[PDB]
Amino acid sequence: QRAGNETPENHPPLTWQRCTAPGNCQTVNAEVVIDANWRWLHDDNMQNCYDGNQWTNACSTATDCAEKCMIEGAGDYLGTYGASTSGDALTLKFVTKHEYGTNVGSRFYLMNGPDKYQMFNLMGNELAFDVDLSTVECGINSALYFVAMEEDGGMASYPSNQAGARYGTGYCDAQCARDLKFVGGKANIEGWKSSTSDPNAGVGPYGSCCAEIDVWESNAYAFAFTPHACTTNEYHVCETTNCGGTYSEDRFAGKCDANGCDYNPYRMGNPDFYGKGKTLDTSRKFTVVSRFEENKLSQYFIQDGRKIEIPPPTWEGMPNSSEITPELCSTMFDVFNDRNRFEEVGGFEQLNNALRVPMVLVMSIWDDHYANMLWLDSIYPPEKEGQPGAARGDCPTDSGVPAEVEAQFPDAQVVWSNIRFGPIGSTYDF
Numbered sequence: 001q002r003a004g005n006e007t008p009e010n011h012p013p014l015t016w017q018r019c020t021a022p023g024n025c026q027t028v029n030a031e032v033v034i035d036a037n038w039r040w041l042h043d044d045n046m047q048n049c050y051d052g053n054q055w056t057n058a059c060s061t062a063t064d065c066a067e068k069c070m071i072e073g074a075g076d077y078l079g080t081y082g083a084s085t086s087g088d089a090l091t092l093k094f095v096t097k098h099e100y101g102t103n104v105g106s107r108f109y110l111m112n113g114p115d116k117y118q119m120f121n122l123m124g125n126e127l128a129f130d131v132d133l134s135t136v137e138c139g140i141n142s143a144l145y146f147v148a149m150e151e152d153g154g155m156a157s158y159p160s161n162q163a164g165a166r167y168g169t170g171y172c173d174a175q176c177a178r179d180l181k182f183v184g185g186k187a188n189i190e191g192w193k194s195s196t197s198d199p200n201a202g203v204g205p206y207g208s209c210c211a212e213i214d215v216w217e218s219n220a221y222a223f224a225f226t227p228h229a230c231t232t233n234e235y236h237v238c239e240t241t242n243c244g245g246t247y248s249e250d251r252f253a254g255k256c257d258a259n260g261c262d263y264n265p266y267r268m269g270n271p272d273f274y275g276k277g278k279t280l281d282t283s284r285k286f287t288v289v290s291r292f293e294e295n296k297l298s299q300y301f302i303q304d305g306r307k308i309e310i311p312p313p314t315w316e317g318m319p320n321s322s323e324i325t326p327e328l329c330s331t332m333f334d335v336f337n338d339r340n341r342f343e344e345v346g347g348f349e350q351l352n353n354a355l356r357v358p359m360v361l362v363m364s365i366w367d368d369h370y371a372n373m374l375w376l377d378s379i380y381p382p383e384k385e386g387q388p389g390a391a392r393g394d395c396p397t398d399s400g401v402p403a404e405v406e407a408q409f410p411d412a413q414v415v416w417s418n419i420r421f422g423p424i425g426s427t428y429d430f
């Protein structure tokens, strides 16, 4: 797709630091840019090509659409999509209300200049950030994470995209981003499945699939640490009944892991750990360092100056420890007694490879039309309840329903700041 001209793109300037030693870091003045989907698409006569949750007759196919339409810059980033930037701190507004419309959710990428993404090496390193999801409630998910995107964002691999990463094109992830309006640079118009309750979203024949390290999924009531691998951690387009995750007829029919190996302290049996007023009090800001090593991923907290470890899981059969090693991803599923997606795509070895795939970092907020975040913060799946890993959060099984959550908690906001990176031991001396 071509780049628009009715509205210049201006990336909000964000700082993060490259460390070598624990208190040996500095100033990298990168930037951020919201995803392609959140962006105006129209031709040269300025009729839309996307309206509501339907492509226009201003278009027609996967290909011609890419020629004749152009995506635009986002105007203001606060009045339109509630994106707030200041120094290191990056803030996101659940529900932005603006004179012309009402946006819910945003998903960004830390950058490297306005033309590329700040790519991260993962294997042998650890991330740090300070988050205050104090006002993030059930049904919401405030997300920080990596996904093996392409640097220039598909502009190169996919010439048709001549707007690329500069305009936050190229998102992929272990579901396969069926809902985006471009994949590989040729549209999803060809039979776009619209959502009955998401007037702006939809689904299209192709996905965009790749490595998805889910450092941060959460709210003020729970959190999960989720690495997911695929049989092609490298960015790739799938095909229709051969796309996975949640936008599809069969979740597990992808070349990737839709669920993966997840560590949620509440799901592993510790309902006293996380929350407002809990041990790891979620009524404010803390730091959450996460750790990537050969067959091991560690996550730890920093709050009120203190080292909070993450408690191990209670259940019989599970290893005596919180880390995400092959060990955990051998028993949790057989106890949680579910389809071991992880295993079938080729276990922790595959995850190893993926931990060498250079990926892009994202911060974001969104509601869950398909399962209203219950997977993250309630009892999921309902079907029964009372079973190991059934309960993930303290949040009622009522919550999530985007409309209700969107209407009642609209000042909802998450703040990402003080992102710190470098080899293990380098970002905090813990």
Ligand SMILES: OC[C@H]1O[C@@H](O[C@H]2[C@H](O)[C@@H](O)[C@H](O)O[C@@H]2CO)[C@H](O)[C@@H](O)[C@@H]1O
Pocket: 214, 226, 246, 258, 259, 260, 262, 338, 371, 375, 376, 381
């Ligand atoms: O629901 C989408 C969500 O799935 C997450 O894995 C879930 C999964 O939804 C459910 O089928 C399984 O039984 O439980 C796991 C634990 O939540 C996945 O981790 C997310 O990436 C995804 O958005």
